[model samples]
Target: SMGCETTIEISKGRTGLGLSIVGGSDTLLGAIIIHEVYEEGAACKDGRLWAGDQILEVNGIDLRKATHDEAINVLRQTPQRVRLTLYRDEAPYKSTRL
Candidate 1:
């Protein structure tokens, strides 16, 4: 699929975005695209979330309604399993945990 989706989570304190978010804020679309993945970080280790993937939700909560920092806050609040929903172009939908 040219455009697919995925769900994943990073362990608490590993909240480095793992992926850089460019532009857009207060909405998932604002996140535009995923940029960098921290080497040895959660997202990178998970090996599914890649650049260009747009984050849509955190722990099932709507990221479209959250500001950039708000979304980070939500991620920080997640301790056990930090769930995420993401969309990508030309990639398979994957579910992962870190």
Candidate 2:
């Protein structure tokens, strides 16, 4: 399959989820993507998420059409435990290329 969806759960760390994002409706990708997973961050330890994965939902909040700032706002408002719906693209990193 070219793309598949998966959900992962994580509890926010002292410095937060340790995740970062790129793209949005305002960019060429048109979807929020996993940009960075800090080695010291919970996201990295969780290991289900990876850079280049497109984020479709966060704790049940839809991000498919959210702008970059809008997506960031939603993520910032999440609770300690978060559920993420992600699209695992076959091309992964290549998909983010301009």
Candidate 3:
């Protein structure tokens, strides 16, 4: 597997892994990647996602070949249980939140 797409459940009464992403622009084949991860959110709290990791998919929707707006769509569609898969180009700290 080039990477793994895993299903992560956001806790009850919790928003989710607080973060946002953008297509790599001039990088990673223009793949979608993390642009922001909220400081007080799950991603920040749990420390799994970072500011440069690529988003492989969302809810099984492959973002590796999608647009920033397209990738953001899945996250904005009121997702509480997100199946987000990621790839870090330069080997990130490897954050994880379960």
Candidate 4:
């Protein structure tokens, strides 16, 4: 019989709309993080962020010295709107999305 795995599967269902990081500002200059792009979202929907893109900068600002709160605030003020610099498989480039 399905035990823990099955129990988890049973709970599988739409868990509501998930949040997506589109564009914003950062206090630092260069910071990278692994993120997944949701289908038909602001960034992905607009062909901004891809599935394997790495966020390298926010609003031309790096995240190396910026705190998490600072990043959140930057995005909060401008939801789904901001310029994003990302590294696509180690190649540096910038993209604007909203």
User: What does candidate 1's lDDT look like per residue over 1-98, in tens digits?
Assistant: 46677787765334554566653475545664566777877778878878767778877778755567776666657655677788776754344678
Give the higher-TM-score candidate: 1 or 2.
2
Sequence-dependent TM-score of model 3 = 0.67
Q: What are the RMSDs of all candidates, in order?
A: 6.9, 2.9, 6.1, 15.8
lDDT of 1 at 27: 54
Off by over 4 Å in 2: 94-98
A best-first ranking of the candidates according to their TM-score comes to 2, 3, 1, 4
Model 2 pairs whose backbones collide? none
Candidate 3, residue 25: Cα displacement in angstroms equals 7.0
- On TM-score, the leading prediction is 2
Error of 3 at 97 (Å): 28
Better of 1 and 4 by TM-score: 1
| Model 4 stretches with alpha carbons more than 4 Å out | 1-34, 90-98
Model 4 per-residue lDDT at 14? 38
- Per-residue lDDT, model 3, residue 97, is 71
lDDT of 2 by residue, 13-37 (tens): 9979897789999999999998888
CA lDDT of every candidate: 0.67, 0.89, 0.64, 0.41
Candidate 2 whole-model C-alpha lDDT, 0 to 1: 0.89
What is candidate 1's CA lDDT for residue 88? 75
Scored by lDDT, model 3 comes in at 0.64
Q: Which candidate number would show the highest lDDT if scored against the true structure?
A: 2
Tens-digit lDDT string for candidate 3 (1-96)? 254344454431265667766554445548776778777887776666667777776766766667666666667774566666777665453456
